[PDB]
Amino acid sequence: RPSFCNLPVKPGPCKAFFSAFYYSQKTNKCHSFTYGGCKGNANRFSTLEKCRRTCVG
Ligand SMILES: [Cl-]
Ligand SMILES: [Cl-]
Fold this sequence. Notes:
The protein contains 1 helix and 2 strands, in the order ββα. The chain has 57 residues and is an alpha+beta fold. Residues 29-30, 52, 56 line the site of one chloride ion.
């Protein structure tokens, strides 16, 4: 997988309520999170299938 998949999930400090997905090295799976809308990192996807295409297979 791309190395940025292994960055830690980062909701950030803002409090908007964006639905998103991230990859976890613990599971080799994508999971949901709530992105607050600012200061995130690249382990963040708008859809489950994009997270999977990028990080899972
Ligand atoms: Cl998955
Ligand atoms: Cl797809």
